[PDB]
Enzyme design. Structure first.
Site, PDB file in Angstrom:
ATOM      1  N   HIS A  43     112.976   6.102  82.938  1.00  0.00           N
ATOM      2  CA  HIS A  43     113.359   6.083  81.528  1.00  0.00           C
ATOM      3  C   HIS A  43     112.376   5.321  80.638  1.00  0.00           C
ATOM      4  O   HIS A  43     112.484   5.358  79.418  1.00  0.00           O
ATOM      5  CB  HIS A  43     114.795   5.545  81.342  1.00  0.00           C
ATOM      6  CG  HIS A  43     114.915   4.049  81.372  1.00  0.00           C
ATOM      7  ND1 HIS A  43     115.366   3.360  82.477  1.00  0.00           N
ATOM      8  CD2 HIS A  43     114.673   3.115  80.420  1.00  0.00           C
ATOM      9  CE1 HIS A  43     115.399   2.066  82.205  1.00  0.00           C
ATOM     10  NE2 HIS A  43     114.984   1.891  80.963  1.00  0.00           N
ATOM     11  N   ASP A  88     116.226   6.355  88.870  1.00  0.00           N
ATOM     12  CA  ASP A  88     115.379   5.789  87.830  1.00  0.00           C
ATOM     13  C   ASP A  88     114.123   5.122  88.369  1.00  0.00           C
ATOM     14  O   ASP A  88     114.065   3.898  88.502  1.00  0.00           O
ATOM     15  CB  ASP A  88     116.191   4.787  87.013  1.00  0.00           C
ATOM     16  CG  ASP A  88     115.720   4.686  85.584  1.00  0.00           C
ATOM     17  OD1 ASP A  88     114.629   5.200  85.278  1.00  0.00           O
ATOM     18  OD2 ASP A  88     116.442   4.086  84.768  1.00  0.00           O
ATOM     19  N   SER A 180     113.538  -3.443  81.227  1.00  0.00           N
ATOM     20  CA  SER A 180     113.633  -2.282  82.117  1.00  0.00           C
ATOM     21  C   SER A 180     112.287  -1.910  82.715  1.00  0.00           C
ATOM     22  O   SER A 180     111.246  -2.065  82.074  1.00  0.00           O
ATOM     23  CB  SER A 180     114.219  -1.072  81.363  1.00  0.00           C
ATOM     24  OG  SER A 180     115.600  -1.264  81.142  1.00  0.00           O
TER      25      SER A 180
END
Ligand code: NAG
Length: 234
Positions: A43, A88, A180
């Site tokens: 992402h 992810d 992230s």
């Protein structure tokens, strides 16, 4: 990262910062695997990704700070969700390699699986408090906790998800927006990739989700080797 402090300048040589050719904002982090490969979250991908290596402060550049663009980006193509968020993870091959130095070094993949109770370290240039982003990366220690804590909060991370649930049940320490894609380090190895948590970060009983790198070891090594038909673990 909330609940921590500025990282030691020499302790995160494998940490890279991701931004774009349009914005200097660090939207994610990543980890250097070898001289020309970076591991991060899927992402975190963007059209014109820019990668900063060897950086600590965004305002005082290290002597060995480097900038790189991708020459290739690889993802899992057998995901449960079409947006691929259940797996992810993404590999970025640097257009030109980097040479190792004080602030640039590779982080080793996990040599074995580690679980509940393991003490790990998180780091990144994400929020350190309500609407506050640091100019230097922050670090803190957290624990891998029972995966059951995450499943309900992120009903898209099922019991069999190849992910690690981690943080501090009492709250106070957690990865946050901007963190992230960064590495979860346990016993000197990268055991996780920051996938995501709850907002605001650091809430009581709301640990975060980290992609479990160990499961993807073979896929990672195959891709780096040049294989292009290898699939991610089911
Ligand atoms: C790529 O990896 C798959 C899975 O390990 C293997 O079956 C296949 O033979 C490999 N292809 C190459 C390029 O050797």
């Amino acid at each position: 990262v909330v609940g921590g402090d500025e990282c030691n300048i020499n302790e995160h040589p494998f940490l890279v910062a991701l931004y774009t050719s349009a914005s200097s904002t660090i939207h994610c982090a990543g980890a250097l695997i070898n001289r020309e490969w970076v591991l991060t979250a899927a992402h975190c991908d963007r059209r014109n990704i820019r990668i900063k290596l060897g950086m600590h402060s965004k305002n005082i550049r290290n002597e060995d700070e480097q900038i790189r663009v991708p020459r290739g980006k690889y993802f899992c193509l057998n995901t449960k969700f079409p947006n691929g968020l259940d797996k992810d993870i993404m590999l970025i091959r640097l257009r030109r390699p980097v040479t190792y130095s004080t602030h640039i070094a590779p982080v080793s993949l996990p040599s074995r699986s580690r679980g509940v109770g393991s003490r790990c370290r998180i780091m990144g240039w994400g929020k350190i408090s309500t609407t506050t982003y640091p100019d230097v990366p922050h670090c803190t220690n957290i624990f891998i906790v029972k995966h059951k804590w995450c499943e309900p909060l992120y009903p898209w991370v099922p019991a069999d998800s190849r992910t690690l649930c981690a943080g501090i049940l009492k709250g106070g320490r957690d990865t946050c927006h901007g963190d992230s894609g960064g590495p979860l380090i346990c016993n000197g190895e990268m055991h996780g990739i920051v996938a995501g948590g709850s907002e605001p970060c650091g809430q009581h009983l709301k640990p975060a989700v980290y992609t479990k790198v160990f499961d993807y070891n073979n896929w990672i090594q195959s891709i780096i080797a040049g294989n292009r038909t290898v699939t991610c673990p089911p």
